[model samples]
Target chain A: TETFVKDIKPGLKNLNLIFIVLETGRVTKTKDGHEVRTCKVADKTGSINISVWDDVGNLIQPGDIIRMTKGYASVFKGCLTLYTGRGGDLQKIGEFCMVYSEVPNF
Target chain B: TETFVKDIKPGLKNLNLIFIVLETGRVTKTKDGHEVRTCKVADKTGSINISVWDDIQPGDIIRMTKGYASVFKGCLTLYTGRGGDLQKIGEFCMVYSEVPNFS
Candidate 1:
């Protein structure tokens, strides 16, 4: 019963949420030459995306505000996703990034 | 058994995990007559949005994660959604702001 972030839906399934944000990081470079990242996370049931990469993008940045621990949800052509890998975990709250965002009643 | 965010809950489904990064190849635009295209994505399970159109930018931030289960079989309404031909890898992460980010 954890799934927060505005109770994500749209064929909702297996969402392992842990997002908190205050970002502005957007790194890129694909088409065979890897390197990707996209930020903008927040809690209290709002804000989305924490997309990461290679070596977990060396952690993360952009107004810094992380906590994306073990995320793994999907829905790419309908919108609604959670990032990270293996079992995911990218914590870095230079300030109080919702302290660990946990506002779920769904 | 890979569910982080301290472990999510509330009926889940579908997924497409794949993410990575190493610098600033990222960019943006979204207004059409001015700019159009948004970004944000990650893996290891945390980070969202990878919206695109007008030639999908950054190649769609390629990195990602997983989930999506017909939104509890009710097709969601009060929250969550689906349509893109009844779910096919979440029809592009289920809507990525062209103008839509309600809570």
Candidate 2:
């Protein structure tokens, strides 16, 4: 089953999910010279922050329906964030079409 | 294949790897009221501070040569479990990245 942002515990492996980009934050740079952005995303359940890296991060925009595979989750400053790994990936599958909520942010 | 510091997944065992200490974070509380130490660790490429639950260190190269797993509540947590440990390999390396931390 597709995992929901609210249900993301962040400790498990190979989390498969789909979400609509609700908002994009400014780009930030890492010591590795990679671009990072903590963007807000959501599905029918709720919303959460996701940190996208480099070229993949640039490809994302508001309303873009993206799919994440083998993604992982973790908390930063008490905020739940999602991320993809070397074996994991994120890609657009659709656009502007889904029921979503930003509340109960988990 | 061996796992890179940035490619670690929670809930797996025998995930042998190496990481350099970039920075160490303060103690934080989990929802379960457990004490966790968030330490920034990385390979020569990337980072995502591991959640230190059982207690460990920052700085000096570290290795989980045998056991240890990862779990989640909000950020990537390095779960300390049976047969898992934090061993200091050495101390000094600037090849670590401080950002793009997935947590």
Candidate 3:
């Protein structure tokens, strides 16, 4: 809502978004207690990498429209990755109804 | 004769290009007695600014052989400063649609 994928700048916080989950990647154990998996999401603006943790990845699927609030944007190896940090939440609002873009605008 | 605008990287030398001249700037004189001009050019790959010194105008098709490329403020720019030559190719010979769109 407040942040679109193309406008998601680095070091951003308290971000709100409504995007479609295009795909989900394999999960891997982190050094911390989190199981991190990469998810690709898109809106009308562009696409970006979203890191999902643990069983949260199982709750979402491709073509699922999600509403995320209070997420944080961080840079990983020169690319932007959006994450629902400690106090953030992501929920499935609908399915395959949102317009999305596959390419990320730099 | 063989370089595309998008493939023009900084520090490149001896570049050959054929593109359409889209726009031209007024001729300005340098304190060193050199006449300078800046113009916009494009191939199918993309558009770039050319630092020119010859008589040219908008809609003029041109060919540059032995030119050099350098980055100016992070944008790719071409220059004939390295002893290259630039000339008008008239309105024919090269097809603008033949160059693939850059991005």
| Top candidate when judged by lDDT against the true structure | 3
List, residue by residue over B1-103, the lDDT tens digit for candidate 3.
4868777778887787788777665678898877778777778786788787644665667888788888776586788766888877876332221111111
* Candidate number achieving the greatest TM-score relative to the actual structure: 2
Against the hidden true structure, what lDDT does model 2 obtain?
0.69
lDDT of 1 by residue, B8-63 (tens): 33455443344332122244554454232333334446543333333222213242
- In candidate 2, chain A reaches a TM of 0.78
Off by over 4 Å in 1: A1-4, A11-32, A37-42, A46-49, A52-56, A59-63, A66-106, B1-103
Model 2, residue pairs in steric clash: A11-B71, A11-B72, A74-B74, A74-B75, A74-B76, A75-B74, A75-B75, B60-B91, B67-B84
Q: Score the docking of each candidate (DockQ).
A: 0.01, 0.01, 0.01
lDDT (10s digit) by residue, model 2, range A1-106: 5677777786766878998777788678877778888888887677888888765664665667788898888887788788886697898897763333221110
Distance from true position, residue A47, model 1, in Å?
A: 9.6
Clash count, one per candidate: 81, 9, 3
TM-score of each: 0.19, 0.42, 0.42
